[PDB]
């Protein structure tokens, strides 16, 4: 199964996943291709905030689904 993760710059990160993977892991992988710790990441999928406690088949994220890498960076 192949997906896409678009960064705010227009760039994209094609990864290799399976439908049972937890969103918390889509980040561990984007974390080697980009080196961005998970706690500063947010994958937006068509207006919704995908949780790290779900899987790719929970939000019907299928073959070629384009999520979005949102950097959660301004402080608290």
């Amino acid at each position: 199964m192949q997906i896409f993760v678009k960064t705010l710059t227009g760039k994209t990160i094609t990864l290799e996943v399976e439908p049972s993977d937890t969103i918390e892991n889509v980040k561990a992988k984007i974390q080697d291709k980009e080196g961005i710790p998970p706690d500063q990441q947010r994958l937006i999928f068509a207006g919704k905030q995908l949780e790290d406690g779900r899987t790719l088949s929970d939000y019907n994220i299928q073959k070629e689904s384009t999520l979005h890498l949102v950097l959660r960076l301004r402080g608290g």
Binding site: L8, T9, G35, I36, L69, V70, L73, G76
Partner: protein, 376 residues
Amino acid sequence: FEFKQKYDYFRKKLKKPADIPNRFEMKLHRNNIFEESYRRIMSVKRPDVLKARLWIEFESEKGLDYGGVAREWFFLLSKEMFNPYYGLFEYSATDNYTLQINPNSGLCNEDHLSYFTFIGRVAGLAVFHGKLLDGFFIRPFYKMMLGKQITLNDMESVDSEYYNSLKWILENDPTELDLMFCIDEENFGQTYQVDLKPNGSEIMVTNENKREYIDLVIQWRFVNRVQKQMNAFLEGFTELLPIDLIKIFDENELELLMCGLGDVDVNDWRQHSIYKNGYCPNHPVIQWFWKAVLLMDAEKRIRLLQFVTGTSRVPMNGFAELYGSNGPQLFTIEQWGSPEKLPRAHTSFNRLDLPPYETFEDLREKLLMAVENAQG
């Protein structure tokens, strides 16, 4: 490409009349530039003569250039016209530095309309001669020139939190928020309530008029109290250029066309920055930061500034006069986190939490990333 293409075609359509002097004669004292410039430009009866070359000399700085004093005269007169304290224009916010027409400009300078056309005469005059004005305006301003309609969407660049709150009113039922068709103003510590429409003070924002309400609020925020002015500004702007010959450009293009890009003066910056929790001027990480900035280009710099302060602009008197939510707040850089984490920022205190990086490119990669892949 697209912008470059357009600009050039723009430049050419313009035409210098043949019955005007070789140059325009200007010589004035740097310390009274506004009024003097005002009288000169605003006395010419053949507004065309102003299409002649800029020939300027001040009885102060006798620099025998007379070509370059043109680049300056604009940078110097701007600091005057677009000064939030002369009363013609003001800042959209205490910490936004983007100018906008002061609705109460009339109650300041007594015949202000003549002055707006003047600022217009100049404003355009600079576009004709490929020069730039100093300072920037809220999108609505540009949009008004272009002949665009102002809307709810346009107040997101000016005040996000307000935008969202209005947009909520737009997509929900507002009966519980118990709003009325009026607003609140302040002056001399006194809060005085103003009606959006007749008897608004007594009318509730139901779910049947909530649209018409978001209308008046925007109408009032950027349009009602400045059409007379904004129109004068155009009377003058078009005494040099054909207003429709510009509609070819867009909100952002027109902006870059007369107010250029906002390249941040890197020095004035470094110099008015404060470091906290470990960092200091000569610290290794800090030393790199700036060398990283040195490398970035105009865009990446302005972005970096926008990511940390929440505004891509800068006050009139530089980084010494920067503001935050609660007032004066210099650019800050505070040490925080492990080298893994990307840099963070609190636009409210114009602060940047910079993890102590081990190598220069180590820092440059994580920084350039936060900057680009940002604003969300």
